Amino acid sequence: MIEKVYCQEVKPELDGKKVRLAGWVYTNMRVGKKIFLWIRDSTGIVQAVVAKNVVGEETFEKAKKLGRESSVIVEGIVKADERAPGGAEVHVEKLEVIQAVSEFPIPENPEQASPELLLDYRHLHIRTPKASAIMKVKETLIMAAREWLLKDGWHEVFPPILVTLFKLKYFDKYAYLSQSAQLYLEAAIFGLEKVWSLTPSFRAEHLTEFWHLELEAAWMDLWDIMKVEEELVSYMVQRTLELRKKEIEMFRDDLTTLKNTEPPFPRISYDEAIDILQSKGVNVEWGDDLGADEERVLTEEFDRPFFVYGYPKHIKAFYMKEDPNDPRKVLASDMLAPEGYGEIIGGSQREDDYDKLLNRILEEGMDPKDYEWYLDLRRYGSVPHSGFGLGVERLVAWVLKLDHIRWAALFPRTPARLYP
Amino acid sequence: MIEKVYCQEVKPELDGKKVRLAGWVYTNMRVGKKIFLWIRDSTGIVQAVVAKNVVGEETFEKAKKLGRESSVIVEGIVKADERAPGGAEVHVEKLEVIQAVSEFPIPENPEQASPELLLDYRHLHIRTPKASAIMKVKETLIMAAREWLLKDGWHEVFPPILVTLFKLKYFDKYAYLSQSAQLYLEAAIFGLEKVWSLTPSFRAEHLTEFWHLELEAAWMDLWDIMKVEEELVSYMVQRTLELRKKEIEMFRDDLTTLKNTEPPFPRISYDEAIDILQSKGVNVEWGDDLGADEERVLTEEFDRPFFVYGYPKHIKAFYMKEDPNDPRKVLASDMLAPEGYGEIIGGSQREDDYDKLLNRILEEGMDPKDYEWYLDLRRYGSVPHSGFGLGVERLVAWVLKLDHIRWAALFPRTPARLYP
Numbered sequence: 001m002i003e004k005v006y007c008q009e010v011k012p013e014l015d016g017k018k019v020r021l022a023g024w025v026y027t028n029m030r031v032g033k034k035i036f037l038w039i040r041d042s043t044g045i046v047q048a049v050v051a052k053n054v055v056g057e058e059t060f061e062k063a064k065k066l067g068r069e070s071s072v073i074v075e076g077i078v079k080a081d082e083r084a085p086g087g088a089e090v091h092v093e094k095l096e097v098i099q100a101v102s103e104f105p106i107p108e109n110p111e112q113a114s115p116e117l118l119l120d121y122r123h124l125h126i127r128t129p130k131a132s133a134i135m136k137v138k139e140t141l142i143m144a145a146r147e148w149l150l151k152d153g154w155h156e157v158f159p160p161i162l163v164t165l166f167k168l169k170y171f172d173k174y175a176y177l178s179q180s181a182q183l184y185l186e187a188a189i190f191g192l193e194k195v196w197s198l199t200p201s202f203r204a205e206h207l208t209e210f211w212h213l214e215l216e217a218a219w220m221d222l223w224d225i226m227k228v229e230e231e232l233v234s235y236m237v238q239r240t241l242e243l244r245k246k247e248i249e250m251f252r253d254d255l256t257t258l259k260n261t262e263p264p265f266p267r268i269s270y271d272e273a274i275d276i277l278q279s280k281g282v283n284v285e286w287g288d289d290l291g292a293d294e295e296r297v298l299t300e301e302f303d304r305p306f307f308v309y310g311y312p313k314h315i316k317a318f319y320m321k322e323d324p325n326d327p328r329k330v331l332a333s334d335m336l337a338p339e340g341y342g343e344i345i346g347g348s349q350r351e352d353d354y355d356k357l358l359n360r361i362l363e364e365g366m367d368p369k370d371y372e373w374y375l376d377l378r379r380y381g382s383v384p385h386s387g388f389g390l391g392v393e394r395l396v397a398w399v400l401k402l403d404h405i406r407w408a409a410l411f412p413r414t415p416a417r418l419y420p
Numbered sequence: 421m422i423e424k425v426y427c428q429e430v431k432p433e434l435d436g437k438k439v440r441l442a443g444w445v446y447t448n449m450r451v452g453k454k455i456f457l458w459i460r461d462s463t464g465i466v467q468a469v470v471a472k473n474v475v476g477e478e479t480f481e482k483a484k485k486l487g488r489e490s491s492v493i494v495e496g497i498v499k500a501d502e503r504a505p506g507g508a509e510v511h512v513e514k515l516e517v518i519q520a521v522s523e524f525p526i527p528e529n530p531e532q533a534s535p536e537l538l539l540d541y542r543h544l545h546i547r548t549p550k551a552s553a554i555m556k557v558k559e560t561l562i563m564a565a566r567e568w569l570l571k572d573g574w575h576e577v578f579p580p581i582l583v584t585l586f587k588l589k590y591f592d593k594y595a596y597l598s599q600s601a602q603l604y605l606e607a608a609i610f611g612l613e614k615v616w617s618l619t620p621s622f623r624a625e626h627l628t629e630f631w632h633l634e635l636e637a638a639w640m641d642l643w644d645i646m647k648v649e650e651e652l653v654s655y656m657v658q659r660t661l662e663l664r665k666k667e668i669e670m671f672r673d674d675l676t677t678l679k680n681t682e683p684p685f686p687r688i689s690y691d692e693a694i695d696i697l698q699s700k701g702v703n704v705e706w707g708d709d710l711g712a713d714e715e716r717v718l719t720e721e722f723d724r725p726f727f728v729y730g731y732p733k734h735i736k737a738f739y740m741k742e743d744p745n746d747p748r749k750v751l752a753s754d755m756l757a758p759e760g761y762g763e764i765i766g767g768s769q770r771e772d773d774y775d776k777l778l779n780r781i782l783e784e785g786m787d788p789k790d791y792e793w794y795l796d797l798r799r800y801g802s803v804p805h806s807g808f809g810l811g812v813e814r815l816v817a818w819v820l821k822l823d824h825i826r827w828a829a830l831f832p833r834t835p836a837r838l839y840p
Contacts, residue, residue, distance in 0.1 A: 022803075024610070042611065042612045042613040071803045098802065123793045124800060126607060126611055131611070142576065143570070157559070158620075158830055160831040160833060161629060163838075173838055175838055187544075187546060187840075190444070191547035192462045193461060193462040200581045200620070218442075219422040220421075373840040374543075376544060380489050380519075380544060381445075381524075383491045392578070409578070410604065411604055418582060418590060418593055420584075
């Protein structure tokens with residue numbers, strides 16, 4: 001048990017006290033006759049002052065050789081000094097060099113490098129301040145979702161990843177990698193009523209692997225689930241603004257759209273969306289899908305997340321409930337982030353009528369035999385119900401205005417990239 | 421928005437108040453001239469009394485046809501009555517039948533059925549009281565782990581599932597399904613120091629898919645990580661005893677070993693383990709693996725979780741640190757549950773010396789080229805570090821004394837079973 005003092009703990013009120021730092025060399029500079037090592041750990045950076053006449057010639061010479069990412073244990077006495085970072089520095093008595101490094105492959109400022117170099121060295125890139133900040137924002141957004149979910153009475157479940165799309169050999173059968181836990185959450189609402197899961201989902205056609213936060217609720221219609229989505233997203237964003245302002249300010253000059261993320265979110269129908277896009281000069285016809293690029297133009301009209309609802313039936317999945325007021329449409333909505341980010345949540349009310357569902361399965365050239373367990377849910381005490389899925393990395397990318405979603409994944413998976 | 425009163429809320433102090441129940445028929449029995457419907461929801465069961473002269477003949481005849489799992493909305497007035505369940509029943513004014521059911525495939529007492537029938541109908545089985553109870557115990561054990569992890573200063577990360585073992589085609593390459601996030605958590609401790617993840621892991625040789633709670637920490641040796649493991653497991657079990665006593669009592673006559681789960685856990689060396697097993701008449705030689713069945717006999721000596729530490733190098737994975745006092749051994753330990761359950765956690769101190777690690781990789785007929793990023797971690801500011809993985813379903817199976825681990829999975833995956 002290395003009993004360490006974290007960098008964030010090194011404060012002017014510790015003046016005259018001994019501390020033990022454990023971390024990595026951030027910078028090494030000679031200042032006067034002395035060596036100033038800035039030591040990084042997970043909480044911050046502290047200035048450790050190494051004086052030849054205190055530590056001796058052998059240690060002083062070792063200290064000169066410590067490049068970026070050298071691992072070190074440092075013991076010394078805190079000195080309050082307004083001119084040091086944090087207003088306190090450490091006057092080094094003992095320096096233990098675990099491993100001297102002089103050729104760390106990630107540049108001092110990593111965004112000087114080619115993104116391809118950074119990704120080939122992803123395992124080293126994630127330790128740097130900005131990449132690390134994204135991971136802290138990610139865990140906080142997720143912690144906040146779990147707070148909200150517990151408070152609001154939702155039950156966490158752990159649905160299957162292997163399903164009967166990536167294909168793999170599975171003993172005497174074949175298995176696919178799940179793209180969504182939804183159908184299994186629908187089975188679970190019959191016992192638990194309000195359920196959620198957080199699972200990796202896979203896309204074999206953009207990350208090919210991503211984190212999927214999904215909710216499903218008995219008794220709720222489309223309008224009810226849209227209230228859930230805006231309440232959940234608002235709490236996640238507000239709680240993260242509260243806790244991670246420092247990290248978010250590394251990525252954003254302007255926090256306005258985040259600050260604006262409180263209920264009620266603006267709501268437009270798909271019909272109004274087509275109107276907005278045609279009125280800005282976009283060649284889209286009613287019934288057409290809104291892909292990435294039409295979504296981008298739509299988001300220009302908004303300064304916070306917003307909903308689009310009431311989609312044409314045939315651009316949405318087989319399981320969606322028809323709008324009973326206009327059977328040409330389904331009771332589906334997506335939540336799009338502003339500033340060009342586009343869809344972060346897709347959800348719907350689900351079809352709860354056995355015959356209507358069987359019929360959609362047939363119409364779509366699917367085999368009702370493969371979906372028998374799914375159809376069972378409309379046979380044994382069917383109830384109205386709705387749910388949705390949020391893309392975690394999509395949300396993080398909007399929150400930090402990232403230029404590619406891959407930076408929101410610890411080790412991103414894309415069609416080109418499986419490594420490290 | 422069906423604005424419902426949950427079954428657990430129906431209490432004698434609501435005497436004379438209107439409530440709306442939404443749920444499923446648990447039982448239907450005629451008592452005198454009246455129909456008593458017991459209505460299940462996610463929180464409990466309430467007795468709803470349907471009287472012909474209150475609801476009318478048409479509703480009364482509909483009520484007679486309601487078998488198990490009929491979905492219903494019930495409005496009525498609470499009446500405090502010591503003889504009804506919960507001491508309060510609902511006198512029905514309005515009964516809305518969403519879907520009458522008379523042939524639910526899961527028997528009234530599901531453990532009358534063949535386990536194979538229950539699994540073929542897993543999507544319906546999970547709604548029943550006991551299967552549901554396991555899921556509530558599971559989410560609580562996990563919630564408790566997250567409480568402990570946050571309090572103790574660990575950072576949550578979201579490591580990769582696809583790695584360069586199940587095999588799949590991945591565009592122009594092949595990918596494998598991860599069996600453990602460990603090597604990626606080792607990369608992440610350089611930025612975050614104390615990290616954890618909860619991911620599905622896969623075993624292609626017992627579930628083939630399971631939930632893996634894994635921790636990794638800079639600066640910690642084997643003895644330090646064993647303290648973490650016993651503190652984490654104790655909090656998870658004590659917090660779950662606190663919250664889920666009702667659920668656990670469904671499965672256990674005796675809570676003693678759970679109550680005994682507090683630090684310090686007993687610790688024996690692998691050498692003492694071999695001694696214990698030989699002294700009970702088991703044919704095991706030093707250097708031999710302890711498989712399922714030797715572990716079972718070992719657990720007889722213990723009344724709470726216990727550690728076995730200091731394994732022969734060649735029964736453990738390539739990445740483990742040699743015991744510097746006896747290089748024939750590695751600094752590995754497993755935590756075994758009592759009562760025959762056996763291993764719930766496997767962990768170790770990791771090798772932090774570049775040459776020793778390179779050498780183990782060679783000795784094991786592996787190609788150091790494939791592990792270059794892993795070896796990088798011993799090149800760029802290596803630090804001592806340790807970690808471990810806990811099997812969530814294994815822990816749940818011990819906690820509830822389950823006769824098969826598959827019952828702890830929402831939708832279990834085994835070599836024989838991919839469905840539903």
